[PDB]
Design a protein around this ligand. Structure first.
Ligand SMILES: NCCC[C@H](N)C(=O)O
Ligand SMILES: NCCC[C@H](N)C(=O)O
Ligand SMILES: NCCC[C@H](N)C(=O)O
Ligand SMILES: NCCC[C@H](N)C(=O)O
Ligand SMILES: [Zn+2]
Ligand SMILES: [Zn+2]
Ligand SMILES: [Zn+2]
Ligand SMILES: [Zn+2]
Ligand SMILES: [Zn+2]
Ligand SMILES: [Zn+2]
Ligand SMILES: [Zn+2]
Ligand SMILES: [Zn+2]
Lengths: 400, 400, 400, 400
């Protein structure tokens, strides 16, 4: 309330700190939005974001590690200069675009919203007269969300093993503190047959294009027995070269989605039967190559969920795919809220690139960053909440 | 020529003996044609044919064994009453019809043409003043040509192991001393899945109807890589019962045809891959049940071929599927000529049943029986021809 | 409360009236359960249910019309003998079983629960000292729910045009005052080709079995672009007779489900394109015959929903396909709650027939009948609720 | 015989003239074989062949038109310098290779064999003491046989309207004066659908890849009802780009072959039904684009056939796809014999390129050129043969 040093006043300070930084946070968004870069190629965005934290006053108050494991990844850390285990709070920035249509998923706003929340938390804790509790604010630039999974590469380097809670936000069509993101497995299927002159001796050949079509048929009829939450999508990248030669090679690219890892394994095995059946029927051999990284479904955290919604409702927010944050949510208690930005456009469309760079989206982006920062303050000053967060994280890991 | 006892006069006598028997041979044809019976159910035809040979004068001059191994099969034998290894000459009678459309393959004429040729040979040898060479005229009633393969059942009982040459003729659209009949393998494919209520939990079921459709697709694309002489035809006998229940059972009936046994084995294995692939893709188990008897392609005999054509050309005959005679032709040197009967209709059509029972067909039937009988006389009185027949039979068995 | 003639005491009386009738209501359930009858063949169940209402004391106090439009349908009506528009309250009894597995949907309990609720309402209103408000209690026996749609035949005869509210309940695995039942369209697809002897001239034929398989393929790949709430299930009833004859006839039986009538029309047209495409590709002609009756989705009524849940919570009930009640819910404000009966078995399984006839199911059946009867009392004595029910019924009809 | 100026001596002179030119004709073959060029890109081969006829002594005795209508086509003409309608005898040179594997159809030998036959005819007629009959020897370089059909472009320019007979020869595995070459129709099929994000709203898209697969299925099952002489081969050139986007475009390339133009039209319409059915089933639109030129089957000429075989048998030759020569054979009486070149390799394989350039192939190439030249001499000095050739050409055009 009106008590000197209360949590409410701390939350107000973080909101005011975000407002004071609205101009340079908007410029940060525009710099990434105006120069769209693809997965692992976000060299400009990496330069803009490291420069941002390096320039925050006082200079070098943020400890910035550019090229953190990946060339376009970075890490920035701040903690109160006091010295009396410190709580580690992570905030993630995404910044890879989509081919042809630019930042059609609003990832420029994700970078902004993660940087704004971190600025808000530090600014709130700097205003604390008495020494603030030991806490480290960690910002992780995670490239290549749309392809590859940079968070997973960072997990593989141990970048998340010391975080207690992780925050980030994603723009979409509605405001929700959690949405069901599915597990994903990607696969490329290559069939190898035996070429033959179809005009002369076509019976001496093994038709790899037949294999591709029969695989497509195997999966298609399988859709009737798929769980309604399952998803299967694929294309025929290579279906032959010339009609006068029986195709001896074909290539399919597929991905499978299911709400749990156990269900994804079942769906993947069923699909493998479909691909291998097409080889048996056509006489070809088959190479089934899975993606470098399976993407996990996002583990919800009930305690973190309720705390964020309470903060958002105070801010005026009215509440109601797959991502590599799912892998993070399995190793660190996190929340991945989606927020509306003033547009009816759908993510991954040209019109969303327009909304993502719009002036209108700035208000909604900074508002959700305020909710994130205020929720981080909750975890810091409510040890009971941190316990419930960890208890919910433990029980959810058992259910898998 | 005009020499007392020459082969030409013997051939004339067989033709005159067939003419004298034209009335009762026609009645024999009509008795089978007017009472069509299916495979293994030819009880009337068996009664008519055994009575025919029993009644040939002098009574019991033909040694008749009714119910010879099969209930509707029979064997009739005659030899000159002299006594001085005897040459064994076989003539086959078929008499099973087709369901619904009667004797649409003219099998009533096959019975007639085999009985007429045997009568002609005996009548010719009875006119020989000097004792005739030792020869046994064997008539074999072979039921169930259109389904089952009664010749194969008779082969299994050793009925053909003592024959030196075998004769029969088949009515069709053109006159040919030999036509390419293919090897055949029949199969019934049953898929077993797991039933489930498609309205509630269809993902808990394994769709046996999917298996049937995927098998159909596997074979269909395979047709492009089939040898142009190969044939594949099949139906879906059972494709489900009710739409509200995921089908847990499906049944397909197929047959495969190829010009050689080696090619039939390759085609059958390729098809087995197609059927088993559908099980793998759908998760069902599969039971592939082959027919009781594989049907062999008909082995040609060049020496017997040329001799029959020379006889037919003298008679006015102008020369240009699968059958269990193919299995016979593998174990006994035989010929299976096709002959025109005065109609443009195709075998296995309703209009062929009309031609088969027509008065017009009698002339052509008795004419081809004359050619058969005259060719049997060639083998009897030309040991050089019997040698060439056996030499051609040996060399053809090596080529398989 | 404890006020002479309050609504609470009226609701208690209906519950006590149902308890007093527990024995004969159980016998009613067992009589239908032990003698399972299929759609439109429920002659025994019709006899049991008409006798039940005819025998309720005083004799002929229920006005019973046997053979009401359908031979196995009936109508029973009671109203207070006072005379001062009367409110018309309908209760539906179902009683058709499923082939082979008996009453695997618990329809014997539906008949019981509808009769019990009607008895409870009458018994409550008979205890009213002052003349009770004008109300007619209508019981409608609706045969053939699992096939045909007897409610629709009754709608076609105008049987529902004078009802203000309609009640019924359905046993399942969980307690819910409303569940999403989908709209359904049934279709039989017949393809007509041209027969030909596949061994001779298969190119002279038009393969109706190809048409069936190609239709199956057309729909199968279409599943990827179906809305996740859509359902398509079908079988190949006729896929050919003999493999030696190119099939000139094939038959498929399908049904389509969608949450709204507008979506069902879109899905049905898409499927019609798939069926007609198979005719074009194969050269066959196609006859697409829709079912006699399309089944509507069930229209929810919010006011009736909340009132029933409040009654059920007081009774201890803890709350969390397609039916011809959907067509009723479009013309009369109704509720179709599902209730647990003490078993984990799924509807339309053999083990559900066991639960449906179990002694355990009686307690849950009579408890839900109490909730229905108490909700009918709400509508009678709360004109504001009847207004909200009609307002919710109007607004829902606009949304379609 | 041994008569001064007989036809036999003229035929000997043509054979000796070909032998004397064996060295430079071999160099002609090697120049084309060592520098393989594709359809319409045979600039080197055009330069070599025009230089060849320009250099034949006396210089400019051959009237040579380079770049005759097509850039790589040419025309060369010689006639006896006497002057007294002249018979026009055409000889065709092909010289386009195949991509990657060079002259795997032996087209370098076709150019050689056409030039050698023309040289042989001129040399024979130059030795005639008395003025020779009026005859024009026309050589036509016809590029782009393997793709496009340069003969058809030349037909369209009227290049064949004044020829009375046309000769050429093609190397293969066996010697035959005529082989059944089929009519061909080529087609590219493009499907246009509606893109949609399969992860979000895949039901808002129309799957053009489905269309491609359904077309493949439509044609595949159609193979069972195809005439055994029909051929259908095609590939999926474009089957989608990324799996996350429902494909809105697909592309198939097919070709169809049948022995007659009437049968090709029937097969093409049946295939068009298959392609259009896939559009209807998937909701896409379809563009069916046929090739620039349909290739005709080769019309046989019996009189020319027998004359060439009689010449070849005297030379030691023992006798036993689709091409644009079929279109020529429809407008000019021609023969297109195939000849063995000393190898077991199949045309359009890497090992045939080895045989085509081999020293061994030269003997067989010059031998068949001798047969061609000797047959041209037959037509010149046998007006009865020219009549029978034209009579056979007329009667064959009626039968189509
Ligand atoms: N990388 C984000 C999740 C995976 C998704 N299918 C994609 O590759 O975009
Ligand atoms: N039995 C005669 C040969 C086999 C043939 N497919 C049939 O069953 O008629
Ligand atoms: N009749 C109840 C709804 C329709 C359902 N598919 C059935 O026929 O059972
Ligand atoms: N041009 C020769 C005939 C046509 C053949 N399919 C090809 O394109 O090679
Ligand atoms: Zn995205
Ligand atoms: Zn994103
Ligand atoms: Zn037959
Ligand atoms: Zn037959
Ligand atoms: Zn039911
Ligand atoms: Zn039910
Ligand atoms: Zn070629
Ligand atoms: Zn060629």
């Amino acid at each position: 309330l009106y008590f000197q040093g209360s949590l409410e006043l701390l939350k107000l300070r973080s909101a005011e700190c975000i407002d004071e930084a609205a101009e340079r946070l908007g410029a940060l968004s525009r710099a990434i939005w105006s120069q769209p870069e693809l997965a692992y190629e976000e060299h400009h965005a990496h330069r803009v974001l490291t420069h941002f934290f390096e320039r925050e006053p006082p200079a070098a108050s943020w400890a910035v590690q550019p090229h953190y494991q990946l060339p376009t990844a970075f890490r920035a850390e701040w903690e109160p200069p006091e010295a009396r285990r410190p709580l580690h709070l992570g905030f993630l920035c995404e910044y890879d675009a989509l081919p042809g249509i630019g930042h059609a998923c609003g990832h420029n706003l994700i970078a902004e919203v993660g940087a704004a929340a971190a600025l808000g938390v530090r600014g709130a804790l700097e205003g604390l007269p008495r020494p603030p509790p030991p806490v480290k604010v960690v910002v992780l630039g995670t490239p290549a969300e749309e392809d590859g999974g940079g968070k997973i590469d960072l997990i593989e380097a141990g970048a998340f093993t010391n975080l207690d809670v992780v925050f980030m936000a994603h723009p979409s069509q509605e405001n929700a503190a959690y949405l069901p993101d599915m597990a994903e497995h990607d696969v490329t299927v290559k069939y190898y047959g035996k070429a033959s002159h179809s005009a002369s001796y076509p019976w001496e050949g093994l038709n790899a294009l037949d294999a591709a079509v029969l695989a497509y048929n195997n999966l298609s009829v399988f859709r009737q027995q798929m769980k309604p939450t399952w998803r299967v999508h694929g294309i025929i990248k290579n279906g032959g070269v010339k009609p006068n030669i029986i195709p001896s090679y074909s290539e399919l690219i597929y991905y499978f989605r299911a709400p749990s890892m156990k269900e994804l394994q079942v769906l993947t095995k069923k699909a493998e039967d479909c691909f291998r059946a097409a080889a048996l029927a056509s006489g070809c051999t088959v190479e089934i190559k899975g993606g470098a990284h399976d993407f996990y479904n996002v583990l919800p955290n009930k305690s973190l969920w309720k705390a964020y919604m309470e903060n958002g409702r105070k801010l005026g927010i009215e509440f109601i795919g797959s991502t590599d944050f799912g892998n993070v949510s399995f190793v660190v208690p996190g929340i991945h809220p989606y927020f509306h930005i003033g547009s009816n456009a759908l993510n991954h469309t040209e019109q969303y690139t327009e909304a993502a760079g719009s002036q209108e989206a700035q208000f909604y982006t900074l508002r959700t960053a305020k909710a994130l920062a205020m929720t981080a303050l909750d975890v810091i000053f409510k040890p009971e909440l941190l316990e419930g967060i960890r208890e919910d994280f433990k029980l959810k890991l058992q259910e898998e």
